[PDB]
Amino acid sequence: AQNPNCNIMIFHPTKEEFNDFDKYIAYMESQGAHRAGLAKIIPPKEWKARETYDNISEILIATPLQQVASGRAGVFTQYHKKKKAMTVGEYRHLANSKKYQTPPHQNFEDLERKYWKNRIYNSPIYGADISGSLFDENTKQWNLGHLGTIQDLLEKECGVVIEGVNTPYLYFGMWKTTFAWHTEDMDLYSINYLHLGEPKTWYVVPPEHGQRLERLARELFPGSSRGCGAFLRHKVALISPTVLKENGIPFNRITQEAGEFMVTFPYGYHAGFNHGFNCAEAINFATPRWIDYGKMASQCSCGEARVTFSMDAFVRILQPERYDLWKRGQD
Numbered sequence: 001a002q003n004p005n006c007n008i009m010i011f012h013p014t015k016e017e018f019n020d021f022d023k024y025i026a027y028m029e030s031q032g033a034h035r036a037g038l039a040k041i042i043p044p045k046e047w048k049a050r051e052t053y054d055n056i057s058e059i060l061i062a063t064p065l066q067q068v069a070s071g072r073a074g075v076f077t078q079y080h081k082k083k084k085a086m087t088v089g090e091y092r093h094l095a096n097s098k099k100y101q102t103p104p105h106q107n108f109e110d111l112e113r114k115y116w117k118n119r120i121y122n123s124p125i126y127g128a129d130i131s132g133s134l135f136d137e138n139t140k141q142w143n144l145g146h147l148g149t150i151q152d153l154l155e156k157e158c159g160v161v162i163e164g165v166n167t168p169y170l171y172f173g174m175w176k177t178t179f180a181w182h183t184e185d186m187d188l189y190s191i192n193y194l195h196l197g198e199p200k201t202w203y204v205v206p207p208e209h210g211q212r213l214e215r216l217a218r219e220l221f222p223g224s225s226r227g228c229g230a231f232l233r234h235k236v237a238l239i240s241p242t243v244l245k246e247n248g249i250p251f252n253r254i255t256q257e258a259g260e261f262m263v264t265f266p267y268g269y270h271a272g273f274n275h276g277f278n279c280a281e282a283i284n285f286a287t288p289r290w291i292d293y294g295k296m297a298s299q300c301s302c303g304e305a306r307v308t309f310s311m312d313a314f315v316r317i318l319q320p321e322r323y324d325l326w327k328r329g330q331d
């Protein structure tokens, strides 16, 4: 069995290997990459996403989100307070202001220490989930707006034709902006490209050990767990590496830098934070190996998780017994 310790693997495809996206995902899995829940892919030196980022300041962040924490430094939830619209140029200036800018630090490890010590005492503002793309239309390799769709994968594997679409999303971050512990909708894959700016640190639990994280989360967030049998789908809970280690939860960590891709694998729980002003693009995708995870994915039916239009068909076809309850939670 490849990668039995479930380490995060880093890949350096050649320009030739970068042509066929599906084939390369399958290659990484042949080497055991999925066992970690997360892999890094460094593009060949010949590749670029677009020519320059000199022209992005006019993108609008219609609903910036202030991420307000509650709890203790290592075990907390966050809620999102909506703020007035601003441009990417305005948001960049805000990220670089004395109130929000990255503190002086020695290295990524010192900054990680500072994040976990101090995160709860600040409320950083995140531009999340903005439909759009920064890949040039002429970029043919690993262009996240030109991937094969999840609807087409489901049709190819299962024969059924369904409604829905699958487009990318932009994320604008600042110091301490946080992504809570989660798997993807329907335990899909994700791919994330860091277009520009400061790094993103990731934490991940191997898929084979995801239920260990769920059981700890129920213990640590006991009111939330009574409210909903899949409350991690709410995407509000944070648990630090120190607390994970105290409780024996297997996990790994890695820092993504500008120009790098990360792939999350089905049922790979992940969380993390941004080091400073940055911009990422991400989208969900599927392969044949996903279908069994989609059929078994948990679902939130309490009303909180609320998701895209396109998840309806996935539930309806893969999880018909759960469909009526889940759709009530949508309505």
Ligand SMILES: O=C(O)CNC(=O)C(=O)O
Pocket: 171, 178, 179, 190, 191, 192, 264, 270, 280, 282, 283
């Ligand atoms: O970058 C972020 O804030 C969150 N991204 C992801 O969870 C992802 O790409 O799957």
Ligand SMILES: [Mg+2]
Pocket: 055, 056, 057, 058, 059
């Ligand atoms: Mg612009």
Ligand code: NI
Pocket: 182, 183, 184, 190, 264, 270
């Ligand atoms: Ni994710």
Ligand SMILES: [Zn+2]
Pocket: 227, 228, 229, 230, 231, 233, 234, 300, 301, 302, 303, 304, 305
């Ligand atoms: Zn719920």
